[PDB]
Amino acid sequence: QLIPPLINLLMSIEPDVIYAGHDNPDTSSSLLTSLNQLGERQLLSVVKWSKSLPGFRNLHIDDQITLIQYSWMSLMVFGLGWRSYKHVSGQMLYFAPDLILNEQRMKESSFYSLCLTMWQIPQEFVKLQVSQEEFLCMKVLLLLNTIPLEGLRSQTQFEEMRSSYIRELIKAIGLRQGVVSSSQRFYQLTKLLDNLHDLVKQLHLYCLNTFIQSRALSVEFPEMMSEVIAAQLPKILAGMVKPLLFHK
Numbered sequence: 001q002l003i004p005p006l007i008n009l010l011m012s013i014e015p016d017v018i019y020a021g022h023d024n025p026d027t028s029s030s031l032l033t034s035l036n037q038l039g040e041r042q043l044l045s046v047v048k049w050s051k052s053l054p055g056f057r058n059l060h061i062d063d064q065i066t067l068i069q070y071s072w073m074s075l076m077v078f079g080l081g082w083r084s085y086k087h088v089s090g091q092m093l094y095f096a097p098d099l100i101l102n103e104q105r106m107k108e109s110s111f112y113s114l115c116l117t118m119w120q121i122p123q124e125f126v127k128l129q130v131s132q133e134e135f136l137c138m139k140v141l142l143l144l145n146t147i148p149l150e151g152l153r154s155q156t157q158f159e160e161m162r163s164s165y166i167r168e169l170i171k172a173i174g175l176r177q178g179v180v181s182s183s184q185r186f187y188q189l190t191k192l193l194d195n196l197h198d199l200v201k202q203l204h205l206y207c208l209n210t211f212i213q214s215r216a217l218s219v220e221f222p223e224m225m226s227e228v229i230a231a232q233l234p235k236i237l238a239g240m241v242k243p244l245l246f247h248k
């Protein structure tokens, strides 16, 4: 009625809750393994989600693959941010119902520092009071927020898709937001998206370091996650992609 049909569809295709399969006393290595196992399960969920996301299946299959490989980390941390905001008021990192971390569980300095970086998202969600409708449109824009330096095969269709979801984000903002306030809120949400490129860079570096050192660290990386990391992370970290920005 009052909620636009595409937003209602986005709510209906959200994945169901995903467990890490964590058994909970962790070591640094067991915790990292558990996080990678959860990552493997979420990656599957992302791909299934993509198959139902209006517009995405109409891009060339190579372009679909490329976009999933470029955005998976961003989608994972954005979803972590939503779940932390919804379930624990942004005050713990709710990776899964069986893997919720508070400060006590963040021993190693490097991992704590990474968690402080991830924590900026749920903090911003709390501050701006992001709604489920906003979040769902923002999440699609994230899937569509980086492309190859030479563009996609389906560039035209891609651009149309991105425009449609930007229009839908404006509808989402209009559900609660005035013409000026609604403009200012658009700015605020699209700047959050721009700022995620820098944030995810830290997560990409940490993951690739952990992956290269995995045998030494006694950390296991499952096959699907290992493939996305080997297929694109070094290239992404090297800057050999084109991040899309809403502001400059």
Ligand SMILES: C#C[C@]1(O)CC[C@H]2[C@@H]3CCC4=CC(=O)CC[C@@H]4[C@H]3CC[C@@]21C
Residues within 6 Å of the ligand: 032, 035, 036, 038, 039, 042, 073, 076, 077, 079, 080, 094, 095, 096, 203, 204, 206, 207, 208, 210
């Ligand atoms: C620890 C670690 C890392 O190597 C760096 C960021 C991490 C991720 C952060 C975002 C994330 C959120 C999830 O809810 C599933 C699990 C992943 C993470 C899996 C492990 C990663 C890739």
